[PDB]
Ligand binder design. Sequence first.
Ligand SMILES: [Mn+2]
Ligand SMILES: [Mn+2]
Ligand SMILES: [Mn+2]
Ligand SMILES: [Mn+2]
Ligand SMILES: [O]
Ligand SMILES: [O]
Lengths: 216, 219
Amino acid sequence: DQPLGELALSIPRASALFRKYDMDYAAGGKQTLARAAARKELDVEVIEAELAKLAEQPIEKDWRSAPLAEIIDHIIVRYHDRHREQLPELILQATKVERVHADKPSVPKGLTKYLTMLHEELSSHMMKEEQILFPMIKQGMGSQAMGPISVMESEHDEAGELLEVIKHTTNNVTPPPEACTTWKAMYNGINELIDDLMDHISLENNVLFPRALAGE
Amino acid sequence: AYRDQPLGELALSIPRASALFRKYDMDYAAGGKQTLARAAARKELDVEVIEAELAKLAEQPIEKDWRSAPLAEIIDHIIVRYHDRHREQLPELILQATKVERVHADKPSVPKGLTKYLTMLHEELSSHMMKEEQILFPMIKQGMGSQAMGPISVMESEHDEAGELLEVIKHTTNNVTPPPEACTTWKAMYNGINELIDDLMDHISLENNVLFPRALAGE
Ligand SMILES: [Mn+2]
Ligand SMILES: [Mn+2]
Ligand SMILES: [Mn+2]
Ligand SMILES: [Mn+2]
Ligand SMILES: [O]
Ligand SMILES: [O]
């Protein structure tokens, strides 16, 4: 089988399939499609059949072979800037939901705290990438960046841990029947954030970082 | 159609239907009044397949139908089959969880907090069963079950708290699924935990869905 990261970046809409299977293609892009079943000891034939047909048409944009400088500029505008705009909004929405629906049992109590931890750590994380690691790659020094890259990958792991908690506090971002408009819309935004953040980390761990280290 | 019957009645009439609902995480014990239809819709599950699985299991009658048994025999059965077993099994699980949380402290999948939650369950369950054995079960055996709305509602409320802890224990243990690196002690403990959950849900089911309502109805 091929690596998770290789398939997610080469087959359109394979990203969401892996996310709903609890398959870590971002920080666990190391993982091959085979061992992914080991976690759940579940069918691989279905996943290969789905993937084979999902690949009817080429990918909208193959970043695997794109210049590293363009990958960087793409990450800044498509993921970093979006994260900075979304998380302050989600924090406020979670505040409103945890107060307005405090008396209900299905309310995701603690979501604001966990979203806030993610915002603080992700902001610092992205500031470090944009001010230290990305410039160093643009100057052609990626081959000497094991240290900084390993620090970012460690922080990627931390963020993934927080994502798992957030997914638990919200029953895998599934609104209960009591969900109002604010509540449902917040969960939609939360799913959007998780989708973007896994594709974001995936692109970094599975393309930008290894290619930089290899001297591209 | 089975989908229109209450969970509790299905569990009490179809052999091993209890295990099918535990596989689907359907609460037939404290939520046995809930119909299979509403329970399956709540979890976005194909109810027609569940009905086929039930019809298969229902090819065979229940080995022992407690729904029509004398209340005194239900009580004596509960005490020996569930209460006495819970008392022997929780102390063993507490010590095993202690050994596992120490020995495998350095591993990621270790069920941190399992000993605390097992202990809370044991404490609340112990006092719960004593209050049943000393207060509620005697009054039902005396023919006063129709005057036991109060005590039964207190027992049912405590059944709900117990279910809350069971849900905590299940999350701490990845739904009682050992990781690949699980040793023998770790695997055997999770087996015991599943046995406890199985028994306690059949235990609570028998009380909420048979003993309590029939006692209140004057049987
Ligand atoms: Mn980044
Ligand atoms: Mn990053
Ligand atoms: Mn009891
Ligand atoms: Mn009881
Ligand atoms: O990032
Ligand atoms: O019980």
